[PDB]
Write a protein that binds this ligand. Structure first.
Ligand SMILES: CC(=O)N[C@H]1[C@H](OCC(C)(C)C(C)=O)O[C@H](CO)[C@@H](O)[C@@H]1O
Length: 513
């Protein structure tokens, strides 16, 4: 392990963060060590921030211009200057805490210059502030109230709902209430949003919303708008798939089957149309090694940064240097960026560690590794998941120390490919024995078996229905897991194909119900 003094000499990165976090959790960072340490942290968010703050709390920040404004309370705010009054009224909790006579006074003070504040003040003088703000069609107020409390729910008329998409909060609002199946009056109201007023993710979610109310014509119009506006081909394909499922225009399915993006939708469309499986690149570097240490996490952070900030020209230089067997995962990574995501790279590095598993298991392992890490041995996530299979420390230590009783086990062994694949196999066995489907296994790998079980216990998820299992896949209640499953499923299909163990993706879909 590295001392704090040694780490401080490394460039700031997630790897340096991880090793600082390891010192913090072992109580090895003194109050003195901690003094300059925020400047040594690359991403000062989450557990590293809360551990550091147990040693040195942060006070900040109050803009010194307004410090005096924060010496008033709800009982003394009428003594504050007008600037201080309006700063403190940025907080809806602060407004809620005022007495109603003071809300009336302040509403009058601000009626001319700040009718937004007046609207919220008089709204909080009623038993339903959301109803008041909706009657005013105060869009900024609406979103401030929703952020304050998700519990408000009311029917919204055609005029009001068509104004909501112009506000930056709309996309997360729509996503959250549709996926969480919350705020039903708001959800029903959003059926009247004109597709002309939405785009991209928002249009797509509004298509999903319309399907849940069996408004299939409105759903088609939203999905069509999403397909026309999405920046990424994979998302466009997801929208075209819905266009096809709803109205069965064979030009939509034809366009989907010819996509440059390899995803479950394009793979499915290819299968339905007797279109050949997409071309998978074959990478076989003749040069066997270079000088790069594939086991140094710091070296990976540094080369990743360079690769991501390389121009079109510098990528060709890095491609050549890393065109070796030993650095195959870095090579494929460089090519994927360098060919602008047009070529399909599905490598199988360190294959000797999995070649004795059955091919279906090989493909599942490889499918997970590809999405988790792109096979980078020293991969570290923002939550400090580790190595090719991206194990969290807690589970790594549980398996390595308690279950397998590996002598001298340390969580950093997860950076060794033999260990990653072996532990991945071990955990995938647990999950698959309980869940069966590779899609459900992927949900549970990323999101946990508890979340997956709770989702599958629901009456409205992965049951029979007109648009199942595709609808359920859109309603997986955690965005990261919803995305992850779709990607890992595609990878799985590809690797099964590459291992001469093909399965029709239609069989996978049938088995979800
Ligand atoms: C190294 C790292 O941050 N890996 C994360 C992965 O990132 C995706 C990819 C392509 C490997 C990138 C962007 O590095 O996304 C997964 C969720 O889909 C996470 O479970 C992984 O922890």
């Amino acid at each position: 392990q590295y001392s704090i003094e040694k780490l401080k000499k490394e460039e700031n990165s997630l790897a340096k963060d991880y090793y600082i976090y390891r010192l913090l959790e072992k109580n090895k960072i003194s109050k003195k060590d901690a003094q300059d340490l925020n400047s040594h942290i690359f991403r000062y968010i989450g557990k590293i921030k809360s551990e550091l703050e147990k040693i040195i709390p942060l006070k900040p920040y109050i803009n010194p211009k307004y410090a005096k404004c924060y010496t008033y309370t709800a009982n003394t705010i009428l003594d504050a200057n007008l600037t201080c009054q309006s700063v403190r009224l940025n907080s809806l909790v602060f407004i809620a805490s005022l007495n109603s006579k003071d809300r009336t006074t302040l509403a009058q003070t601000f009626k001319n210059q700040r009718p937004d504040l007046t609207n919220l003040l008089l709204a909080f003088n009623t038993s339903d502030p959301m109803s008041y703000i909706v009657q005013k069609e105060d869009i900024n107020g609406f979103f401030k109230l929703y952020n304050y409390s998700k519990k408000y729910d009311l029917d919204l008329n055609t005029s009001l709902v068509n104004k909501l998409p112009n506000h930056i909060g709309f996309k997360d609002f729509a996503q959250n209430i549709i996926i969480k199946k919350e705020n039903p009056k708001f959800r029903h109201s959003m059926l009247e949003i004109n597709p002309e007023n939405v785009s991209e993710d928002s249009a797509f979610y509004l298509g999903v919303n319309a399907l849940t109310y069996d408004k299939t014509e409105l759903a088609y119009d939203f999905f069509k708008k999403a397909a026309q506006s999405f920046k990424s081909q994979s998302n466009k394909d997801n929208a075209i798939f819905w266009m096809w499922l709803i109205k069965n225009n064979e030009e939509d399915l034809k366009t989907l089957s010819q996509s440059s993006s390899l995803n479950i939708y394009s793979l499915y469309a290819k299968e339905l149309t007797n279109t050949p499986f997409p071309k998978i690149e074959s990478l076989n570097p003749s040069k066997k090694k270079n000088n790069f240490n594939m086991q140094d996490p710091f070296a990976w952070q540094k080369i990743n940064k360079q690769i991501r900030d390389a121009n079109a020209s510098q990528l060709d230089v890095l491609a050549k240097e890393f065109d070796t067997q030993e650095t195959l995962p870095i090579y494929a990574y460089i090519l994927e960026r360098k060919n602008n995501f047009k070529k399909h790279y599905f490598i199988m590095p360190y294959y000797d560690n999995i070649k004795d598993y059955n091919k279906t298991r090989q493909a599942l392992i490889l499918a997970i590794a590809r999405q988790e890490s792109r096979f980078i041995p020293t991969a570290i996530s923002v939550s400090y998941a580790l190595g090719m299979m991206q194990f969290m420390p807690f589970l790594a230590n549980h398996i390595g120390e308690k279950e397998l009783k590996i002598p001298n086990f340390d969580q950093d062994f997860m950076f060794k490919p033999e260990i990653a694949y072996y532990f991945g196999n071990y955990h995938l066995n647990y999950l698959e024995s309980r869940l069966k489907s590779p899609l459900f296994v992927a949900y549970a790998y990323n999101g946990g078996i508890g979340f997956t079980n709770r989702m599958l216990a629901r009456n409205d998820m992965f049951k029979t229905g007109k648009f199942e299992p595709f609808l359920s896949m859109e309603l997986v209640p955690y965005q990261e897991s919803r995305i992850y499953g779709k990607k890992v499923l595609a990878n799985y299909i590809v690797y099964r194909h590459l291992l001469n163990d093909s399965i029709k993706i239609s069989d996978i879909f049938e088995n979800l119900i």
